[PDB]
Design a protein around this ligand. Structure first.
Ligand SMILES: [Mg+2]
Ligand SMILES: [Mg+2]
Ligand SMILES: [Mg+2]
Ligand SMILES: [Mg+2]
Ligand SMILES: [Mg+2]
Ligand SMILES: [Mg+2]
Ligand SMILES: [Mg+2]
Ligand SMILES: [Mg+2]
Ligand SMILES: [Mg+2]
Ligand SMILES: [Mg+2]
Ligand SMILES: [Mg+2]
Ligand SMILES: [Mg+2]
Ligand SMILES: [Mg+2]
Ligand SMILES: [Mg+2]
Ligand SMILES: [Mg+2]
Ligand SMILES: [Mg+2]
Ligand SMILES: [Mg+2]
Ligand SMILES: [Mg+2]
Ligand SMILES: [Mg+2]
Ligand SMILES: [Mg+2]
Lengths: 397, 127, 150
RNA sequence: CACGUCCCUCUCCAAACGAGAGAACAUGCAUGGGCUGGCAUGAGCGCGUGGGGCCCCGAGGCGCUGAACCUUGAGGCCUCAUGCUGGGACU
RNA sequence: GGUAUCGUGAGGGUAGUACGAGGUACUCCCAUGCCGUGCCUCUGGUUUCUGGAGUUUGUCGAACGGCAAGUGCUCCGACGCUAUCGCACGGUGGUUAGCCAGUCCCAAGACCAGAUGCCCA
RNA sequence: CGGCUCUUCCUAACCUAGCGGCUAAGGGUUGGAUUGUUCACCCACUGACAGGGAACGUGAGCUGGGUUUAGACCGUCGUGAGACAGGUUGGUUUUACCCUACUUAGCUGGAAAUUGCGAGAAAAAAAAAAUUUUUUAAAAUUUUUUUUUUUUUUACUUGGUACGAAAAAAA
RNA sequence: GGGUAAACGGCAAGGUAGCCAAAUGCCUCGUCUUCCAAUUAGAGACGCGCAUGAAUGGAUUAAUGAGAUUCCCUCUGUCCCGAGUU
RNA sequence: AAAAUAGAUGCGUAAGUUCGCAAGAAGCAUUGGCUCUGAGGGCAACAACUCAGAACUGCUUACGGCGGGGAAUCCAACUGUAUAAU
RNA sequence: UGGUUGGCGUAGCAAAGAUCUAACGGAACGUUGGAUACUGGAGCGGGGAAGGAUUUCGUGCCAACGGCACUCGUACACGAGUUGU
RNA sequence: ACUCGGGUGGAGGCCUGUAGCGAUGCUGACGUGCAAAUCGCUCGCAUGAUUUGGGUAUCGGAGCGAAAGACUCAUCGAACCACCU
């Protein structure tokens, strides 16, 4: 006898019914806090590693640089476009209603369509003309009265700005809409944060901050109808085995006289929703145009960019704000991953640690990439024939 | 820290040690909590029950202890520096961990030398 | 569908179907060529032609056959065969011994050497006491000067 | 018939097939370039075992030459440059 | 009534575990093992990019370029896939270790008068 | 038979946990030599190497070592052919494409669970803002006035949307 | 009545030479030694041989063996513990 | 089961033995390319193509094909035959 | 005994590497050219025995058969064909 | 006294290994198959007691057997056919 192969609380292992990785539960509201947003949609870019000086009493690495992998997650600001209130009921939370923003970016209204550009594009057209009228202004006014009254939960309906993402590979132009809960103070305080913020952008740096952790939720990378050996980790059978090796030899017994829900079976692996915890935020990163010397740490002064030399493979440059957080993040490159405020206690000696990066890595992913910089590669090879066949042309002109 | 396991039971690592043992045959790894089919596996710094398979007869047919001081199976430092050896040899040692040799042959690993205060001293080098 | 003429052209071109060439551009005139005599008219008339056999050059080999003469491609790694398969011991012994028996026979005929010593050497030639022709060539010289002194 | 959905078509974070995600004139696709990598110095002409009669034959070597080529394709990057650009089903 | 979007969450699943060292004999630390959930920056493995090179025999008259050897074979090899062979992570509350709730996973045949967008010939 | 594989359940608890033997089924309970084995015994680890059920769990899952038909050998028995739960050796492991279970994957209906029109909401019971008071088309169906949105000529991540203005249209 | 066991056979005679827990030994995983960290295996001894043994051939045998069996070196995905490609 | 050995040449080759063997025992070693050299004959008064050697030079150890080896015990001496279809 | 059925348009039709192109044909696979491979002389070669006995050949045909298709066939129909001191 | 080199020669129910004849192992494929015994690789013999065509002889209470009750037309511890039935 050995332990069971696989966690039964991650089950059924079925395809997620979404891809945007929506938060399942927001961290519990704390009135003592000032109001804030609790999550932020971001696009996985790729990974690198960083050097860091761990300064953790105990261990053999205190005061010693350690190479942590990091995931880079491009994070163009989300736009709030509507508030949502929930009222508690004996049967469970009910939306009171939502107040949509007076205006909606097309990328958002793209979301209500399968073919926006061959549509009449009438989405939020009556709201636009009605929220304008005093009749619809008083109606919007009444919804907020209902929030301030009957609500227990205020939530912004934010979305991603894919227009601003300018990624060439994330093909979506429908915005990634999602309610983002406002934990904070009294419901009027949450309404007020909610409505002042009701058509504004929301950068991650406001929601998060460095060294703080974030729970991540994104659908994990899809593997199709995976077999039982890859899906559950069961031992494959000895070579001599007949019908085939890669099987659970015994999927049941005489009784109960049927396969139980607990025996492992071939089927969908990957592309499951996951909430992974306590991912330290090694740096929030401002957009490359605004703060070009990303990845230029105090100890590595060369002006530099968070994106590797070949760009991120399959993704390309991170043109925007980026969250850089320790370790792996579930989901393939360029998937949209919601990442919430931590729901764990976060009073751990580790979790509270400030993270001063000593060296973001920027070598090519693609090959081994022994250069941190496109300038430095040229500084190795120096001029070569592509230039001499270039330099000569310039002289002739 | 973590050192990717290198020398499963049944392995014959060399004796780097001063003693007349020529090579060790790992029998089991001390501190090995076992999963079912998994073979116990010594890695760098690990104490190991080992019988000398070749060398002075006096050592030849009893189980002995031996820490692993180098390892062909490469491992990754927390420093992010994956590293490995030409060979993977251990040194004979007491259950206490005092080494019975008088001087180790080749380089000793950093995390052999740090777990074993005596091994570190006789080590010609640490790596 | 001129599959008959191609049967016929191949026969009277005295070749395979593979070589006969029915002109693609005139299938119809070929098409009404029911008799071998019709097809023979088409063969002189050029609608049907025999293609040359596909080449199989020896130029790579003749260039190799030069290099092998100069001793190229000869050594230990280039030898599959046992030294005896690669060149038989019986083949060398025959050549060696046919050569000795002939030279002993040439001298006996011109009587450079006695009909006596011929047995003296015909029988030593058979016991390879003579490695070569010129080994025996000089032994006949030195087996004979020993006589010249007396 | 509206809104719209779907098919066909294109893309892939999806994918046994359905489903999914997207696109829907869009740097979308296509080549090209630049880049990031890979390999490792192309073709071609222009020191050398000896050899043949100052040249010729000569493996190898040198020089142009980190060159040549390959680099997104089950689907690296860059807009950098040019090229090409709806029908059906349903209610 | 369509279509679409955001959610609700009854119900069901459910998981973390162990060891050691430190510190002072609880707290508090710090590593590791196992388990589990991922991920692929690095490192290893994997090559049908048959990518680039080398190379063997056959072959293309030859050089070049190939080609055949069911991927000829050897070297290096990106993408990708993957390994406790790399790496990240594994949270609470309430009741009597259990147990229940939560977090976590599926979640309206739990038919959601929840919200919402658009059109309602 | 056994193993392997995988799951699961029990506890007269081996370890772990809490106590002071008791509770405690939670999670875990090793790798090997001999032998088909189980079992036992050993070696080593271990916090420990607990005992069991599931058709003595599990062969259209396997393996086929045990048992193992015909061949053969030996011992014993038999006059013999032949026998031996004695030993030895060699000795085809078939089929799911059905139903259900299960595992993923889709589609579509449905609230008199497809019907009745058979009518029940965890809804509200002139409107909104600070229960009461004040403000939101007017004047004689049409006209006029006001407000809001769209088009043209600073603050937001920085290409594209907002408020600026002015004009037109709708209420 | 006689003869015959290289007749069937036994060990009338009482198992000789040999050989063995042997493909033959129940007891039994015998005992000892050797092999390993550990050996119900093996080899080698031993012989209270349930029930060895002499052409129902005994013993021993170099060479031979797709025969049984044990171990060794090399080797490896058998395995740890699976991964990738076709 | 797979891997492994592998061709040729030169060395070297144990027990045991019926003196044949065992034996390809085992075990090391060298091997390409190239430009040369040497050797080995015929018929009169031109023909092979093997072996050998030498420099120089190259290796990514880079087709196909091609033994894994050893130590022991049981049985049968050997090659053979033989239950077509366990 | 005959017929019919569900399973079911399912299980399969996965051994021996392979076709591509244009032109023509045709009502729509063949034919030719080219390309590309294969067999690889113990051959998907060229002749015979046994056996078969018209399969041969041409024209036509493709209803049925050639387990897909056929315009093609060893199939179908018609006409031919085998010569010895 | 008949030994030690070296060659020669080509022996052998000799060896490696084709063809051919088998058929050990994978207890591999297949296992309502290509096949009422096949396929793959592996393997065994392959100058011999070898393999093989034709012919001929010997069979059913029988034949034939290097002996497995093996084989005697997919039939054998007594073929097959008909019959008694
Ligand atoms: Mg099997
Ligand atoms: Mg990479
Ligand atoms: Mg593309
Ligand atoms: Mg049973
Ligand atoms: Mg069963
Ligand atoms: Mg109804
Ligand atoms: Mg014995
Ligand atoms: Mg007897
Ligand atoms: Mg034999
Ligand atoms: Mg084998
Ligand atoms: Mg000898
Ligand atoms: Mg025999
Ligand atoms: Mg048989
Ligand atoms: Mg089918
Ligand atoms: Mg060929
Ligand atoms: Mg015909
Ligand atoms: Mg006919
Ligand atoms: Mg022979
Ligand atoms: Mg043999
Ligand atoms: Mg019998």
């Amino acid at each position: 006898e050995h332990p069971r192969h696989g966690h039964l609380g991650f089950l059924p292992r079925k395809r997620s019914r979404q891809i945007r990785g929506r938060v399942r539960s927001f961290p519990k509201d704390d009135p003592s806090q000032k109001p804030h947003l609790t999550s932020f949609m971001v696009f996985k870019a790729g990974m690198t590693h960083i050097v860091r000086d761990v300064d953790r009493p105990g261990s053999k690495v205190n005061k010693k640089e350690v190479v942590e992998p990091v995931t880079i997650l491009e994070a163009p600001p989300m736009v709030v476009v509507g508030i949502v209130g929930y009222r508690q009921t004996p049967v469970g939370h009910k939306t009171i209603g939502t107040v949509w923003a007076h205006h909606t970016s097309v990328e958002f209204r793209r979301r209500f369509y399968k073919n926006w550009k061959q549509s009449a594009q009438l989405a939020f057209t009556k709201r636009k003309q009605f929220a304008r009228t005093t009749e619809g202004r008083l109606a919007e006014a009444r919804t907020l009265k209902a929030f301030a009254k009957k609500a227990d939960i205020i939530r912004v309906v934010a979305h991603t700005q894919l227009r601003k993402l300018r990624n060439n590979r994330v093909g979506v132009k429908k915005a990634h809409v999602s309610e983002i809960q406002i934990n904070g103070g009294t419901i009027a305080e949450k309404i007020e944060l909610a409505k002042s913020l009701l058509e504004k952008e929301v950068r991650i740096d406001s929601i998060f901050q460095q060294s703080e952790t974030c729970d991540v939720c994104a659908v994990t990378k899809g593997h199709g109808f995976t077999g039982v050996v890859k899906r559950w980790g069961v031992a494959c059978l000895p070579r001599k085995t007949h019908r085939g090796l890669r099987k659970v030899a015994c999927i049941g017994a005489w009784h109960p006289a049927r396969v139980m829900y607990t025996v492992a079976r071939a089927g969908q692996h990957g592309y499951h929703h996951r909430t992974h915890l306590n991912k330290k935020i090694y740096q929030l990163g401002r957009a490359v145009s605004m703060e070009p010397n990303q990845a230029t740490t105090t100890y590595d002064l060369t002006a530099k960019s968070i994106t590797p030399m070949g760009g991120f493979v399959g993704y390309g440059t991170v043109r925007n704000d980026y969250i850089m957080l320790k370790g792996s993040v579930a989901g393939p490159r360029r998937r949209v991953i919601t990442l919430r405020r931590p729901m764990a206690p976060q009073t751990s000696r580790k979790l509270t640690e400030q993270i001063t990066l000593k060296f973001i890595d920027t070598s090519s992913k693609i090959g081994h990439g022994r250069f941190q910089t496109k300038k430095e590669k040229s500084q190795w090879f120096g001029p070569l024939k592509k230039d001499r066949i270039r330099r000569e042309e310039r002289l002739r002109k | 820290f973590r050192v990717s396991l290198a020398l499963p039971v049944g392995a014959v690592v060399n004796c780097a040690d001063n003693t007349g043992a020529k090579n060790l045959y790992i029998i089991s790894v001390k501190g090995y909590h076992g999963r079912l089919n998994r073979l116990p596996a010594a890695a760098l710094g690990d104490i190991v029950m080992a019988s000398v398979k070749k060398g002075k007869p006096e050592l030849r047919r009893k189980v002995l202890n031996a820490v692993i001081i180098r390892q062909r199976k490469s491992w990754r430092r927390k420093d992010g520096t994956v590293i490995y050896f030409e060979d993977n040899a251990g040194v004979i040692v007491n259950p206490k961990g005092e080494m019975k040799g008088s001087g180790i042959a080749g380089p000793v690993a950093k995390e052999a030398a740090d777990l074993w205060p005596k091994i570190s001293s006789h080590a010609p080098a640490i790596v | 569908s001129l599959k008959l003429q191609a049967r016929l052209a191949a026969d009277i071109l005295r070749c395979g179907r593979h070589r006969v060439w029915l002109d693609p551009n005139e299938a119809s005139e070929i098409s009404n060529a029911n008799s071998r005599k019709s097809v023979r008219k088409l063969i002189k008339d050029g609608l049907i032609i025999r293609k040359p056999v596909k080449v199989h050059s020896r130029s790579r080999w003749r260039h190799m056959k030069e290099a092998k003469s100069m001793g190229r491609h000869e050594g230990a790694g280039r030898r599959e065969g046992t030294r005896e398969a690669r060149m038989p011991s019986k083949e060398l012994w025959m050549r060696r011994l046919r050569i000795l028996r002939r030279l002993l026979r040439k001298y006996r005929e011109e009587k450079k050497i006695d009909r006596h010593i011929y047995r003296e050497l015909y029988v030593k030639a058979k016991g390879n006491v003579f490695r070569n022709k010129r080994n025996l060539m000089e032994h006949i010289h030195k087996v004979k000067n020993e006589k010249k002194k007396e």
